[PDB]
Design a protein around this ligand. Sequence first.
Ligand SMILES: [Zn+2]
Ligand SMILES: [Zn+2]
Lengths: 147, 192, 209, 97, 114, 293, 48, 278
Amino acid sequence: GAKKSAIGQRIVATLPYIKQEVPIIIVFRALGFVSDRDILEHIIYDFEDPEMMEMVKPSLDEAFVIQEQNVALNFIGSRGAKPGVTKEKRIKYAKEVLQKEMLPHVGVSDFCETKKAYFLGYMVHRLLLAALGRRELDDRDHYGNKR
Amino acid sequence: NNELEPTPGNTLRQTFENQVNRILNDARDKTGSSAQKSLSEYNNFKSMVVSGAKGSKINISQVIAVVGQQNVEGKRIPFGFKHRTLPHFIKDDYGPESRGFVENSYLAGLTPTEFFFHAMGGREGLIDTAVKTAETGYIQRRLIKSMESVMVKYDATVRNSINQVVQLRYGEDGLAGESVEFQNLATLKPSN
Amino acid sequence: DDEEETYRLWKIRKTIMQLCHDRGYLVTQDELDQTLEEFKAQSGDKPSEGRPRRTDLTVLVAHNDDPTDQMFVFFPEEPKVGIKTIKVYCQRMQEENITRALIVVQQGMTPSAKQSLVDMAPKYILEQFLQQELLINITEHELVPEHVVMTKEEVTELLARYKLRENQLPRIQAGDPVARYFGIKRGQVVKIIRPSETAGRYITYRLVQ
Amino acid sequence: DREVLRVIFPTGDSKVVLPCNLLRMIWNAQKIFHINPRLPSDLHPIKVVEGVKELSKKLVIVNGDDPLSRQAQENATLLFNIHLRSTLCSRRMAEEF
Amino acid sequence: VGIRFCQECNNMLYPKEDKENRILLYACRNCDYQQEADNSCIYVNKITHEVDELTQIIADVSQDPTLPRTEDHPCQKCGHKEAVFFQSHSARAEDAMRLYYVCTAPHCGHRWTE
Amino acid sequence: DGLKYSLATGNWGDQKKAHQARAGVSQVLNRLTFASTLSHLRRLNSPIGRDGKLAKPRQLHNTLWGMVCPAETPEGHAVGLVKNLALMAYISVGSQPSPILEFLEEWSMENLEEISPAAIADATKIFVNGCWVGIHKDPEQLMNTLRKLRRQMDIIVSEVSMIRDIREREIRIYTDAGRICRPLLIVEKQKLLLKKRHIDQLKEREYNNYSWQDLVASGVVEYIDTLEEETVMLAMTPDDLQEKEVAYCSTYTHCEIHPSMILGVCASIIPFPDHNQSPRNTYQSAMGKQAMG
Amino acid sequence: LRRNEQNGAAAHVIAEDVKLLQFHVATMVDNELPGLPRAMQKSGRPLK
Amino acid sequence: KDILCRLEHTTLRKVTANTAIYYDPNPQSTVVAEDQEWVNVYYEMPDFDVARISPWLLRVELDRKHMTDRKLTMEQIAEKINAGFGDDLNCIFNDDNAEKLVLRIRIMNSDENKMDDDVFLRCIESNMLTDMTLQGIEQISKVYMHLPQTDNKKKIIITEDGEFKALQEWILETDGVSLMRVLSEKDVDPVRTTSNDIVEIFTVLGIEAVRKALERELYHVISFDGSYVNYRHLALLCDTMTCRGHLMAITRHGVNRQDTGPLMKCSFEETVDVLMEA
DNA sequence: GACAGAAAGCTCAAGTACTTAAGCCTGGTCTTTACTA
RNA sequence: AAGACCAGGCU
DNA sequence: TAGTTAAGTACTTGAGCTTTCTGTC
Ligand SMILES: [Zn+2]
Ligand SMILES: [Zn+2]
């Protein structure tokens, strides 16, 4: 497609209890990080590598239309289990989903959003490293990956 | 030292694997031939293989000389650990010992790593035996259901249940397949 | 460019002369066998803004039994053919009172023009042929055996000998490339002669449906 | 028949599957009738050709008198008749068998 | 070439063409900050990827006890005999077997390729 | 009744939700032979569906070395999906990562809230049970101190596994349960830490209250799980691979107790198993459970 | 449904009973209907 | 080798070393060092610098190894790009003397006389690299060339003495199938060129060709193991599959599209549905 | 009367629902009904 | 009674 | 005591481009 060829690879997330895919930058803004420098500072740990910037760039452009944290929360809530009648109900439901069902091992108290941001940024960074070929794909039959 | 030139139509890895496999197969074949030549006329392995009752020249070679290379999915033993096969070997070791070549014979006994690699090799055969049966049976059933009504009529024509003609003579010559034998034309090949 | 386009046109013309000869139409040995240099000299070499336009190439051939039947082969100049162009060809066809003709399309034909071909069927019969399909004679391939179109008397004798109704025979669809090559219609029976490694020779009959 | 065989079998593969083993059969006859290869034979070369021709009529796969039936019968038994004539050649009978 | 950020809202700069002076500039669409570009390149694409991996490999890999090491190849700057060697990791190149060498001593992080 | 039903029928879940409940757990104990009873008490099951024609999860993986018997599996639709435990394999029971985090905070580590994200590139990440806790700038001394404390059993239980991935700059610590591990001898330089006094005391084990736990507490033997073996250089035997030759390796860090410990209960009764074909070893491992006695 | 039709109770209850009867009649012939709740016996077992 | 290079699909991406998009607002005062020479050579008597010419520059580098392996010409590449896109790109290209092999591309002159200019140039790059189709036939991944040692792929001819002589000639084996255009190709043998795809042989040559080709494929897959199966069974299977005039697969679909009794069909793979339709 | 625009139409790529899933044989144990009313 | 799960055997 | 997973084909639907007729110049 004309759009797809221009953009390239986009990163999307399949959150629990949310209907469909959500762009990564929208989730990061919903976590409370409005600024693109902060978002890329959590994603990319070294700014001197241009290949990582080239990989990340279309994802930023896809989610440019949402710039406010409340707008991002409403965007996520619109794709929840059911569309809430009132906008603030959707916002509260999305906040509860992002506090409880998103990365519960990282934390549950409302202070831990920063740690959730780091862990999600690490997930995206590992995905980017796999896409660049700088790391080997994990083997599912590796017996250390099993319990 | 990057002196190896890549073969046409092949990757550098592909040609490296091809050369190593060639060397090891030649070695295994030569050792087997020597072992077969060393056999006496009274040897019971030879007495069983020659008559064709059971066993074979590769079984004799593996018993006496060298068990040979072990393969998984038609390839040499892979790297289940990061860049090595077992924690006993060093990373990036493409030598025959590290990648599953069994130097010893069954009579001499296998080293621990060769034993594990041979177990890996036999597991593939067991899995293939367990898996292929369902597909083969499903193909057989579908063939039988498709052909079950095809039959030779008293016209010597071959027709299905709807009397549609499949063949005007069975086998295009009208002969049963049990009374025929192999023969030579003796007019086809000669010079004029 | 133009040397390759000349080569393509020569291939197409040779395959069309073989087509007409195989359909039983009077084609002279010189027309069947024309060297590239002879064809080049006859039609004036390079086609682009040159002597072999596509309209310079049309073929009229006569049937052996009756010279009245005849047949035209057309080479449209357009990459795609339309209802207007086919109606022009049909107007010329009516003027020349011929009944059968071909069309050699460079790329493809619009479905409205395909439906126009079949709409005409009781009056005039037109057959579409793509340019690539005529770039090689599939009848000369090793996999394709010899095909012979049977007459009605032969079909009747066949059905009386084997006491068969027509639908009991093996079938061949009208869209088959060999059926297009031989210009075979629904209801006709073809005779296929192929070698066998058990008997030596075997004859098969396909009904066209 | 040689030209027909060369048309039918490109690559020159002479191994063919046919009903009855003529070489074994000729060898059986030689031992049954105590035939001495060292001595001249009393078999008249016309009778070889005539017997082959008359035997070829008695091997019927398609029964009929129509030209279509004749052609079908010929196509069905072409390869075996070629092999039979090749093996029962009059010269071959006089020299080898 | 690579990313740069507006200095007031720390958001992406992306390039625009000035129509009057006919010069390229960087403008962050969340504000009015315009800054003249100094690189005349906005996008580069190393299709054949012929970049040598010396920057990707780290000197800390010298402490790995499962890597092989030889005394044959000496380091250039210090000449310590011991040097651990290992293979490429680029998936996509015209070659796949060359050895990357890392000097083994604690302070000499020298990495080179033969 | 919930415990009684789920242990009796084998369906693992609510009886009203039995359709969603996993089945096959808690079979009737096999009493045909003592070896059969032992093999049934030491057995592992892959939850992958038996109907799947995909061969990949059934194949003998490299990482099963010393953990899972290579010879012993059932024959049929469950080839490679039912696996028996090796003789010396031990499954971790799990522990809380409370003291480890406290020690890491004492050992100069940086909390996840206090990192300047510019300095996160050079430093090495630290993971505890998957959760990223912080970063550290001197992985060498940290990893040495952690191994010393684990070997001294001081505040790190011997069941805790620690792994340093040098190329990716990560350090992972697992206290999680369910990890399979096996004991190994520690090698320092080219010499075992097991010496003649340890063997003398173990030979006088009776009436000396000196046992395998005292051997572990001395820092001689160590438990190592699957993904820590990736960073381990193992020697098959000491007298053969530790002694000087035209050297393959000199950085050996561990040594196997005995290579025959890679076999299971049923495969350990086979005389001369290295002189046989592996399918025949598997057949014997399966038939030994049916031998009468 | 016959009783409720003789009473003429309310068109909604008639339609609901018709839907329930449709479900049961269809599920007696085919219980593997996707997109619909498969019928259950008191055991929690699906019907054959 | 000429036929191999003419048969293999080659995109512009395979021969392109790297791509960079530059901003050069004026033709002559170029930001690159080397381009100045040929820039002046082309613009001292300027080719189509008549309307305005765009500030945005696209610059592709070509690896000499891949350029000379396929016997390509930069004139050929410029001709192909210019013909495939029309006049909407102006192509500036170097002579082969230049060590750094450069092809300077700018957007249409009549556009500087919808999409944003640099973004459009990125979309062009992403289109050319995947779609330009420099050489050969698409859906042809790789072509292998070798001398066959098996008599079934060796050309065997009859000499003047009537003997059978086996000849060794180069044959090509492709990955991916496009049979029609390959049979069209110059110096390819139309009589003997064949593929292993059954539907491809069908749609090209007809039903008797599929009969024979399917027979050959079945014979190959059965006799590769060394086993022997009588010809009659293979012939019967092929005849049943190709009897109705089209390729009847031996599946529920193919078997049940026969006009047989419903009780025969219910006993194969669609039990209740067959009876419901009947 | 000749052009163009707006029409019904038509064909041709993506997305969705549905199907099958080797043969035979031997045992054992468990459970149909527990929960609201 | 019947249904369910599981385990094993011969290819 | 009553209820209470992985493949493959066929079909549908939506995006892209022909003819013809009807209006306006
Ligand atoms: Zn800004
Ligand atoms: Zn150094």
